[PDB]
Paper text:
MrpH resides at the tip of mannose-resistant Proteus-like (MR/P) fimbriae and is required for MR/P-dependent adherence to surfaces. MrpH is a two-domain adhesin (TDA) consisting of an N-terminal receptor binding domain (NTD) joined through a short linker to a C-terminal pilin domain that attaches the TDA to the fimbrial tip. Although MR/P belongs to a well-known class of adhesive fimbriae encoded by the chaperone-usher pathway, we found that MrpH has a dramatically different structure compared with other tip-located adhesins in this family. Unexpectedly, MrpH was found to bind a zinc cation, which we show is essential for MR/P-mediated biofilm formation and adherence to red blood cells.
The structure of MrpH153 was solved to 1.02 Å resolution using single anomalous dispersion, and the structure of the longer MrpH159 construct solved to 1.75 Å by molecular replacement using MrpH153 as the search model. In both MrpH153 and MrpH159, a metal bound by three histidine (His 72, His 74, His 117) side chains was found. While optimizing crystallization conditions for MrpH153, we carried out thermal shift assay (TSA) experiments to identify conditions that would stabilize the protein and promote crystallization. A melting temperature (Tm) shift from 66.7 ± 0.6°C in 10 mM HEPES buffer, pH 7.5, to 78.5 ± 0.1°C in 10 mM ammonium tartrate pH 7.0, 100 mM NaCl, was observed. Based on the TSA results, ammonium tartrate was added to the MrpH153 protein solution prior to crystallization. Consistent with the significant stabilization of MrpH153 by tartrate in the TSA experiments, a molecule of 1(+)-tartaric acid could be nicely fitted into the electron density for MrpH153, leading to an improved model as indicated by a drop in Rfree of 0.8%-units. One of the tartrate carboxyl oxygens (O1) ligates the Zn2+, completing the tetrahedral co-ordination sphere around the metal, and in addition forms a hydrogen bond to the main chain nitrogen of Arg 118. The second oxygen (O11) from the same carboxyl group forms a hydrogen bond to the main chain nitrogen of Asn 82. Both hydroxyl groups of the tartrate molecule are also involved in hydrogen bond interactions with MrpH153 main chain atoms: O2 with Arg 118 N and the carbonyl oxygen of Thr 116, and O3 with the carbonyl oxygen of Arg 118.
Numbering used by the authors: 25 to 157
The structure:
Amino acid sequence: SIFSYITESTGTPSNATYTYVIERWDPETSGILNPCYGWPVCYVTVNHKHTVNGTGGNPAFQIARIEKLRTLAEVRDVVLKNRSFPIEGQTTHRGPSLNSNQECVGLFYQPNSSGISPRGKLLPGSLCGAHHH
Ligand SMILES: [Zn+2]
């Protein structure tokens, strides 16, 4: 899994600043494929759920191009070549009202590097918020 969580949200549901941590991404040994392999263009980004449908906002930042990577293990490898964990920062949501259970910062895949990201979604295995106990 990919573990991330918001540690504070300030503002209002539709105009919020999230302080976040992407803590770790465990090794990928399940043969999961990259959902955007073979798209014309695909990026892995740090982004938030922007809509009640869980689609992406304007990314906090883009990490790498991934459309040539067939597997999620390869996506993880490229992320690690570009960035160390943990990833921390703040990002701001201005848009649809979201409750705490609808708020999430994590690693998204998406066709666009920036701007609102309706075709972006969390990578498979993303556990946003409280992990399992
Ligand atoms: Zn947003």
